[PDB]
Amino acid sequence: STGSATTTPIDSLDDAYITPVQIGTPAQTLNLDFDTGSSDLWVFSSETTASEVDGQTIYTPSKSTTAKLLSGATWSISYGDGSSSSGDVYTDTVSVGGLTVTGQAVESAKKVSSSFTEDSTIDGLLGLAFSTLNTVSPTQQKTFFDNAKASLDSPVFTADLGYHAPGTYNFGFIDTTAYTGSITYTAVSTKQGFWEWTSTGYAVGSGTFKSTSIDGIADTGTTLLYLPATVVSAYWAQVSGAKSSSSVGGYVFPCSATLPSFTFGVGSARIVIPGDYIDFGPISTGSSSCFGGIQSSAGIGINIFGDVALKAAFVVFNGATTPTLGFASK
């Protein structure tokens, strides 16, 4: 089997991407944030505290003839950005882009933190990291990909995120029309439960490439590119008037600037992030200070190749017995 779904930016900045997911019988379609940096599929629901729901579509398990309470199971998650959610668990039929899993754990939120409530466009998360990170207790549950894997034509999914445009998530096949040149594959460590890999270095604009190992994770659920402070300083030094602002919480730059590109290495290959991809717009409405898309990972404890980097590539998440990542230009 295969599946193929379109993923759409939630706003004009590509702050996140949502993908429609069918849950239950008859189908209830919710728009979920596909997150290769976590392993829970959780949804706003009929059980979510009413004051914490503001415009999201909810899953109502009592309206699904295939929903079953997973008795005794609870979940609770805290993300890198300080947001959180928790609740109880159902199993139900979940379909993505025509690919169906029966008996998927659907984690129903009883509580969500304010950042979830305030984002009316995201109805929940679909985690695509390794199932060792899943938070369901006392019986840990499998991701949608891990449940689908054995049925797929190939044990892979691909992320093809758009810049200010829709893109695609495919399951079980590699669309050879969706990228240019060849896919370069690179080793993955699953020791922290992430799609963790080592970039071979970077360049800023038309500058020389610096060969240096940068360990980090491929994370579709993180908006920005978080790298070591040395690398980030080297990038922003090429932008007149850019500075790190403790009050704003990262590097800002004059909205009048033209940003340089950023290149990262994948083995002997190179992925080029155009400068425009690194502009996240005014820090507040009407400001002439703009927020940068490349930020320091200092204090986060890991480097994160989030959407700013991934949207410059066609990315293969290879779930074979020994997982690997693939990157192609597009």
Residue 249 bridge partners (DSSP): none
Q: Report angle CA 201, 205, 209 to the nearest 5 degrees.
A: 30
State whether 137 and 24 are in the same domain.
yes
| HSE toward the beta carbon, residue 252, CA cutoff 13 A | 15
Same domain, 160 and 198: no
146 and 185 in a single domain? The answer is no
Count Cβ atoms within 10 A of the Cβ of residue 281 and give its class: 0-12 exposed, 13-18 middle, 19 or more buried: middle
Contacts 24+ apart (CB under 8 A), 201-208: 201/264, 201/265, 202/227, 202/231, 202/262, 202/263, 202/264, 202/265, 203/262, 203/263, 203/270, 204/234, 204/235, 204/238, 204/260, 204/261, 204/262, 204/263, 205/238, 205/260, 205/261, 205/275, 206/260, 207/238
Q: Which tokens is 276 given? A: 């425009």
User: For the chain, after which residues does the C atom lie more than 2.5 Å from the next written residue's N, i.e. where is it broken?
Assistant: none
Residue with tokens 């990315």: 315
CATH number of the CATH domain containing 263: 2.40.70.10
One domain, residues 120 and 199: no
Whether residue 276 is found in the same domain as residue 308: yes
Split into its structural domains, the chain has a count of: 2
Same domain, 96 and 193: no
Q: Which of 174, 201, 223 marks a domain boundary?
A: 174
Whether residue 174 contacts residue 4, with contact meaning beta carbons closer than 8 Å, is answered with no
Q: What is the CA radius of gyration of the chain?
A: 20
Q: Is 76 a catalytic site residue?
A: no
CB 164 within 8 A of CB 14: yes
Query: Of residues 131, 199, 261, 296, which has the active-site annotation?
Result: 199
Looking at the structure, do residues 194 and 270 belong to the same domain, yes or no? yes
**Are residues 200 and 326 located together in one domain of the fold?**
yes
Experimental method: X-ray
Amino acid occupying residue 209: F
The domain of 19 spans 5-174
Measure the CA–CA gap between 178 and 328, rounded to whole angstroms: 9
Phi then psi for residue 291, to 5 deg, are -90, 135
Beta bridge partners of 84: 78
Query: At a CB cut-off of 8 Å and minimum separation 6, what does 88 contact?
Result: 47, 69, 70, 73, 74, 75, 107, 108, 110
| Cα–Cα nearest to 30, from 12, 55, 66, 62 | 55
135 in the same domain as 25: yes
In angstroms, how far is the first alpha carbon of the chain from the final one? 25
Cβ contacts of 280 within 8 Å, gap of 6 or more: 13, 223, 224, 290, 291, 292, 293
Catalytic site includes residue 35:
yes
Q: Measuring CA to CA, how many Å separate 46 from each of 52, 56, 105, 110?
A: 11, 11, 16, 9
Nearest Cα neighbor of 95 from 220, 7, 3 is 3
Q: Provide the residue type at 59 as one letter.
A: Y
Catalytic-labelled residue, pool 33, 35, 40, 92: 35
- Contact, 44 vs 1, CB < 8 A? no
Q: Which residues, at least 6 apart from 200, have a Cβ–Cβ distance to it below 8 Å?
A: 211, 212, 213, 265, 266, 267, 268
* Cβ(25)–Cβ(65) below 8 Å: yes
In sequence order, the 6+-apart residues with CB closer than 8 A to the CB of 194 are: 36, 37, 129, 130, 133, 217, 218, 219, 302
- Where does a domain end: 113, 144, 174? 174
Could you tell me if 10 and 16 are in contact, meaning their C-beta atoms sit under 8 angstroms apart?
yes
Shared domain for 91 and 186, answered yes or no, is no
- The conformation of residue 137, written as its DSSP 8-state character, comes to B
Q: Is there a contact between 31 and 57 (Cβ–Cβ < 8 Å)?
A: yes
Residues 169 and 186 in one domain: no
What is each CA distance from 47 to 60, 273, 290, 307, in whole angstroms?
Answer: 8, 42, 39, 31
Contact (CB, 8 A) for 304 and 296: no
Q: Write down which residue in 134, 158, 174 finishes a domain.
A: 174
Q: Please state, in angstroms and rounded to a whole number, the distance separating the CA atoms of residues 328 and 185.
A: 9
* Same domain flag for 9 and 113: yes
The amino acid at residue 191 is K
